[PDB]
Amino acid sequence: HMRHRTLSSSPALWASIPCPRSELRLDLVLASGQSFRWKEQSPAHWSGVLADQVWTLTQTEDQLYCTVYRGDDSQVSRPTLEELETLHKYFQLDVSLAQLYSHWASVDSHFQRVAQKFQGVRLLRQDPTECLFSFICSSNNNIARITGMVERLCQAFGPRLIQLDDVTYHGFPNLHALAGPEAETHLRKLGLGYRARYVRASAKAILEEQGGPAWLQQLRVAPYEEAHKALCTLPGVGAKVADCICLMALDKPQAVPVDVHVWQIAHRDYGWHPKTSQAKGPSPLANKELGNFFRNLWGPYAGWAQAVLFSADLR
Numbered sequence: 242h243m244r245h246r247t248l249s250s251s252p253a254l255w256a257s258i259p260c261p262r263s264e265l266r267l268d269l270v271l272a273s274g275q276s277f278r279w280k281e282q283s284p285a286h287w288s289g290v291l292a293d294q295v296w297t298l299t300q301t302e303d304q305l306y307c308t309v310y311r312g313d314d315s316q317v318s319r320p321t322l323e324e325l326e327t328l329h330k331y332f333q334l335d336v337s338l339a340q341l342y343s344h345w346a347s348v349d350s351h352f353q354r355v356a357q358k359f360q361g362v363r364l365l366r367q368d369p370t371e372c373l374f375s376f377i378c379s380s381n382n383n384i385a386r387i388t389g390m391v392e393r394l395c396q397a398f399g400p401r402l403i404q405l406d407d408v409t410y411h412g413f414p415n416l417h418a419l420a421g422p423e424a425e426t427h428l429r430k431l432g433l434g435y436r437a438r439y440v441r442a443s444a445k446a447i448l449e450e451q452g453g454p455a456w457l458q459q460l461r462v463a464p465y466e467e468a469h470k471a472l473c474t475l476p477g478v479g480a481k482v483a484d485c486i487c488l489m490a491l492d493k494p495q496a497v498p499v500d501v502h503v504w505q506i507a508h509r510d511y512g513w514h515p516k517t518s519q520a521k522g523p524s525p526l527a528n529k530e531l532g533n534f535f536r537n538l539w540g541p542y543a544g545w546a547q548a549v550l551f552s553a554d555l556r
């Protein structure tokens with residue numbers, strides 16, 4: 242039956258949020274390593290799952306268009322007000338990106354050069370569960386492969402939502418689903434390798450040691466340093482993965498996930514070398530120190546700044 246919508250196809254089923262392309266570029270955000278669930282199924286039209294619903298999004302120079310599929314054959318209709326608020330929050334559009342960009346440019350001529358061409362890179366505000374398992378899958382991995390891993394994970398363990406053309410969409414599974422006795426064996430069959438063990442074990446630990454997903458919501462209102470440390474008690478989550486989750490899902494805009502790529506940027510583009518430390522390359526301490534350097538430079542939205550450079554570098 243149902244088909245992926247285009248803005249031309251079905252105008253009566255799309256709504257608009259006023260949004261300049263300088264505040265948000267879909268093509269530098271939806272597949273640049275934050276969410277792994279969005280795909281450009283037709284030119285300029287991006288489809289993906291948000292919270293047990295499927296959306297399609299496209300934009301003009303000043304407008305963000307979106308359409309929702311409920312699927313549970315309710316009648317097709319335009320997105321409601323509440324659904325539009327959900328999306329406004331997902332893209333955190335209350336925060337001005339242009340003001341952050343100049344604040345960062347004012348102390349960083351490197352960022353200023355890169356910013357000319359790479360406008361509209363901002364941070365999604367993601368569901369903690371989804372973000373956590375997605376980033377556990379990110380170790381020694383690339384966007385394309387994580388994307389496949391995550392997609393097979395959701396088809397095997399989470400509820401079916403809808404089909405559009407040849408694509409069946411699933412919701413992200415709950416913890417109890419990933420914690421079960423065959424869960425690791427199954428995930429290895431789905432090609433996750435060693436990451437399969439950390440998926441299952443983290444699901445179990447959140448459930449049994451921490452009281453379920455209410456714990457991730459508590460981390461969202463706890464301070465950065467506290468949330469980061471608590472995530473690092475999980476199987477397969479270290480400083481880098483935990484910083485991703487802090488940045489992308491627990492409202493820690495100052496979190497700077499330090500890996501080999503940010504080391505390369507720091508050294509090449511900024512001339513940084515460890516000072517306090519003397520281990521001349523990556524180390525737990527030198528990586529903490531490099532996160533501090535970026536926070537010191539850019540201020541408390543350092544995580545967002547470094548996001549611009551990541552999307553820039555992916556082209």
Ligand SMILES: NCCc1c(-c2cccnc2)[nH]c2ccccc12
Pocket residue numbers: 273274275379382383384485488498500502503547548551
């Ligand atoms: N230094 C890149 C870290 C990273 C990110 C990332 C993206 C935006 C903002 N902050 C971090 N997405 C990834 C996907 C796979 C592997 C590593 C990453």
Ligand code: NI
Pocket residue numbers: 508514
């Ligand atoms: Ni050097």
